[PDB]
PDB file of all heavy atoms in Angstrom:
ATOM      1  N   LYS J  23    -137.022  40.549  93.063  1.00  2.00           N
ATOM      2  CA  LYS J  23    -137.899  40.127  94.098  1.00  2.00           C
ATOM      3  C   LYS J  23    -137.226  39.052  94.942  1.00  2.00           C
ATOM      4  O   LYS J  23    -137.406  39.024  96.205  1.00  2.00           O
ATOM      5  CB  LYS J  23    -139.199  39.607  93.569  1.00  2.00           C
ATOM      6  CG  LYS J  23    -140.294  39.161  94.708  1.00  2.00           C
ATOM      7  CD  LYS J  23    -140.736  40.441  95.589  1.00  2.00           C
ATOM      8  CE  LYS J  23    -141.674  40.025  96.522  1.00  2.00           C
ATOM      9  NZ  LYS J  23    -142.905  39.498  95.906  1.00  2.00           N
ATOM     10  N   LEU J  24    -136.465  38.203  94.321  1.00  2.00           N
ATOM     11  CA  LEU J  24    -135.674  37.111  95.094  1.00  2.00           C
ATOM     12  C   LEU J  24    -134.534  37.651  95.735  1.00  2.00           C
ATOM     13  O   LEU J  24    -134.046  37.230  96.763  1.00  2.00           O
ATOM     14  CB  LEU J  24    -135.299  36.035  94.118  1.00  2.00           C
ATOM     15  CG  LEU J  24    -136.374  34.937  93.760  1.00  2.00           C
ATOM     16  CD1 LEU J  24    -137.549  35.613  92.989  1.00  2.00           C
ATOM     17  CD2 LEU J  24    -135.779  33.760  93.069  1.00  2.00           C
ATOM     18  N   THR J  25    -133.844  38.788  95.139  1.00  2.00           N
ATOM     19  CA  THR J  25    -132.752  39.394  95.860  1.00  2.00           C
ATOM     20  C   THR J  25    -133.123  39.881  97.218  1.00  2.00           C
ATOM     21  O   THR J  25    -132.302  39.968  98.110  1.00  2.00           O
ATOM     22  CB  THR J  25    -132.088  40.463  94.935  1.00  2.00           C
ATOM     23  OG1 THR J  25    -133.063  41.471  94.720  1.00  2.00           O
ATOM     24  CG2 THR J  25    -131.691  39.819  93.616  1.00  2.00           C
ATOM     25  N   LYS J  26    -134.390  40.440  97.316  1.00  2.00           N
ATOM     26  CA  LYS J  26    -134.869  40.877  98.643  1.00  2.00           C
ATOM     27  C   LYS J  26    -135.303  39.770  99.470  1.00  2.00           C
ATOM     28  O   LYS J  26    -135.434  39.836 100.673  1.00  2.00           O
ATOM     29  CB  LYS J  26    -136.055  41.823  98.341  1.00  2.00           C
ATOM     30  CG  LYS J  26    -135.704  43.026  97.524  1.00  2.00           C
ATOM     31  CD  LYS J  26    -134.540  43.897  97.991  1.00  2.00           C
ATOM     32  CE  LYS J  26    -134.279  45.099  97.189  1.00  2.00           C
ATOM     33  NZ  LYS J  26    -133.187  45.934  97.651  1.00  2.00           N
ATOM     34  N   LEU J  27    -135.418  38.535  98.938  1.00  2.00           N
ATOM     35  CA  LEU J  27    -135.866  37.340  99.647  1.00  2.00           C
ATOM     36  C   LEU J  27    -134.667  36.701 100.170  1.00  2.00           C
ATOM     37  O   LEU J  27    -134.921  35.610 100.920  1.00  2.00           O
ATOM     38  CB  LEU J  27    -136.623  36.454  98.683  1.00  2.00           C
ATOM     39  CG  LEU J  27    -137.501  35.314  99.233  1.00  2.00           C
ATOM     40  CD1 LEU J  27    -138.569  35.857 100.295  1.00  2.00           C
ATOM     41  CD2 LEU J  27    -138.117  34.510  98.169  1.00  2.00           C
ATOM     42  N   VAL J  28    -133.440  37.164 100.013  1.00  2.00           N
ATOM     43  CA  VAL J  28    -132.191  36.348 100.348  1.00  2.00           C
ATOM     44  C   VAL J  28    -132.229  36.082 101.889  1.00  2.00           C
ATOM     45  O   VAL J  28    -132.624  36.903 102.760  1.00  2.00           O
ATOM     46  CB  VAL J  28    -130.961  36.968  99.872  1.00  2.00           C
ATOM     47  CG1 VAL J  28    -130.738  38.381 100.615  1.00  2.00           C
ATOM     48  CG2 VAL J  28    -129.799  36.157 100.124  1.00  2.00           C
ATOM     49  N   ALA J  29    -131.700  34.775 102.238  1.00  2.00           N
ATOM     50  CA  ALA J  29    -131.595  34.513 103.628  1.00  2.00           C
ATOM     51  C   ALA J  29    -132.776  34.484 104.366  1.00  2.00           C
ATOM     52  O   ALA J  29    -133.223  35.169 105.405  1.00  2.00           O
ATOM     53  CB  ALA J  29    -130.574  35.422 104.394  1.00  2.00           C
ATOM     54  N   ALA J  30    -133.772  33.587 103.892  1.00  2.00           N
ATOM     55  CA  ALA J  30    -135.058  33.344 104.412  1.00  2.00           C
ATOM     56  C   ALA J  30    -135.483  31.912 104.364  1.00  2.00           C
ATOM     57  O   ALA J  30    -134.865  31.078 103.528  1.00  2.00           O
ATOM     58  CB  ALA J  30    -136.046  34.191 103.722  1.00  2.00           C
ATOM     59  N   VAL J  31    -136.364  31.417 105.181  1.00  2.00           N
ATOM     60  CA  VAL J  31    -136.709  29.993 105.311  1.00  2.00           C
ATOM     61  C   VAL J  31    -137.512  29.564 104.012  1.00  2.00           C
ATOM     62  O   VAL J  31    -138.555  30.139 103.753  1.00  2.00           O
ATOM     63  CB  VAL J  31    -137.503  29.720 106.595  1.00  2.00           C
ATOM     64  CG1 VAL J  31    -138.054  28.354 106.457  1.00  2.00           C
ATOM     65  CG2 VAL J  31    -136.713  29.952 107.778  1.00  2.00           C
ATOM     66  N   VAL J  32    -136.963  28.603 103.300  1.00  2.00           N
ATOM     67  CA  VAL J  32    -137.574  28.156 102.060  1.00  2.00           C
ATOM     68  C   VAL J  32    -137.677  26.512 102.126  1.00  2.00           C
ATOM     69  O   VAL J  32    -136.801  25.906 101.526  1.00  2.00           O
ATOM     70  CB  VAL J  32    -136.842  28.511 100.834  1.00  2.00           C
ATOM     71  CG1 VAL J  32    -137.587  28.241  99.572  1.00  2.00           C
ATOM     72  CG2 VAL J  32    -136.452  30.152 100.932  1.00  2.00           C
ATOM     73  N   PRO J  33    -138.656  26.059 102.785  1.00  2.00           N
ATOM     74  CA  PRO J  33    -138.811  24.586 102.997  1.00  2.00           C
ATOM     75  C   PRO J  33    -138.820  23.854 101.745  1.00  2.00           C
ATOM     76  O   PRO J  33    -139.432  24.262 100.753  1.00  2.00           O
ATOM     77  CB  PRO J  33    -140.007  24.445 103.857  1.00  2.00           C
ATOM     78  CG  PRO J  33    -140.776  25.563 103.636  1.00  2.00           C
ATOM     79  CD  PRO J  33    -139.900  26.726 103.280  1.00  2.00           C
ATOM     80  N   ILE J  34    -138.279  22.626 101.688  1.00  2.00           N
ATOM     81  CA  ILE J  34    -138.263  21.724 100.514  1.00  2.00           C
ATOM     82  C   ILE J  34    -138.601  20.416 101.085  1.00  2.00           C
ATOM     83  O   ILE J  34    -138.295  20.107 102.157  1.00  2.00           O
ATOM     84  CB  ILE J  34    -137.002  21.829  99.762  1.00  2.00           C
ATOM     85  CG1 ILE J  34    -135.733  21.291 100.417  1.00  2.00           C
ATOM     86  CG2 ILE J  34    -136.709  23.169  99.023  1.00  2.00           C
ATOM     87  CD1 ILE J  34    -134.602  20.769  99.719  1.00  2.00           C
ATOM     88  N   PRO J  35    -139.215  19.530 100.159  1.00  2.00           N
ATOM     89  CA  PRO J  35    -139.347  18.009 100.635  1.00  2.00           C
ATOM     90  C   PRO J  35    -138.389  17.005 100.149  1.00  2.00           C
ATOM     91  O   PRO J  35    -137.736  16.215 100.892  1.00  2.00           O
ATOM     92  CB  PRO J  35    -140.768  17.798 100.154  1.00  2.00           C
ATOM     93  CG  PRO J  35    -140.823  18.596  98.833  1.00  2.00           C
ATOM     94  CD  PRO J  35    -140.069  19.802  99.057  1.00  2.00           C
ATOM     95  N   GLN J  36    -138.159  17.029  98.748  1.00  2.00           N
ATOM     96  CA  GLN J  36    -137.431  15.893  98.122  1.00  2.00           C
ATOM     97  C   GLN J  36    -136.021  15.785  98.470  1.00  2.00           C
ATOM     98  O   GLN J  36    -135.404  14.724  98.263  1.00  2.00           O
ATOM     99  CB  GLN J  36    -137.690  15.996  96.551  1.00  2.00           C
ATOM    100  CG  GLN J  36    -137.296  14.719  95.819  1.00  2.00           C
ATOM    101  CD  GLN J  36    -138.062  13.528  96.314  1.00  2.00           C
ATOM    102  OE1 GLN J  36    -139.335  13.523  96.386  1.00  2.00           O
ATOM    103  NE2 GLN J  36    -137.324  12.492  96.651  1.00  2.00           N
ATOM    104  N   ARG J  37    -135.314  16.921  98.817  1.00  2.00           N
ATOM    105  CA  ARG J  37    -134.013  16.974  99.250  1.00  2.00           C
ATOM    106  C   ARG J  37    -133.016  16.572  98.012  1.00  2.00           C
ATOM    107  O   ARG J  37    -132.003  15.971  98.278  1.00  2.00           O
ATOM    108  CB  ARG J  37    -133.725  15.977 100.365  1.00  2.00           C
ATOM    109  CG  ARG J  37    -134.320  16.522 101.699  1.00  2.00           C
ATOM    110  CD  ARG J  37    -133.379  17.618 102.340  1.00  2.00           C
ATOM    111  NE  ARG J  37    -132.196  17.058 102.698  1.00  2.00           N
ATOM    112  CZ  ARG J  37    -131.089  17.860 103.108  1.00  2.00           C
ATOM    113  NH1 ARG J  37    -131.261  19.258 103.190  1.00  2.00           N
ATOM    114  NH2 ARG J  37    -130.023  17.435 103.390  1.00  2.00           N
ATOM    115  N   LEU J  38    -133.379  16.921  96.751  1.00  2.00           N
ATOM    116  CA  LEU J  38    -132.479  16.648  95.692  1.00  2.00           C
ATOM    117  C   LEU J  38    -131.221  17.616  95.566  1.00  2.00           C
ATOM    118  O   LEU J  38    -131.442  18.665  96.208  1.00  2.00           O
ATOM    119  CB  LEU J  38    -133.391  16.675  94.361  1.00  2.00           C
ATOM    120  CG  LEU J  38    -134.373  15.616  94.036  1.00  2.00           C
ATOM    121  CD1 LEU J  38    -135.091  15.864  92.943  1.00  2.00           C
ATOM    122  CD2 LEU J  38    -133.602  14.281  93.990  1.00  2.00           C
TER     123      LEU J  38
END
Side-chain angles (χ1 to χ4, degrees):
Chain J
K23 184 66 177 302
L24 279 68
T25 61
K26 305 300 179 181
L27 197 60
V28 65
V31 173
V32 190
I34 62 155
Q36 194 56 55
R37 291 281 296 171
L38 290 175

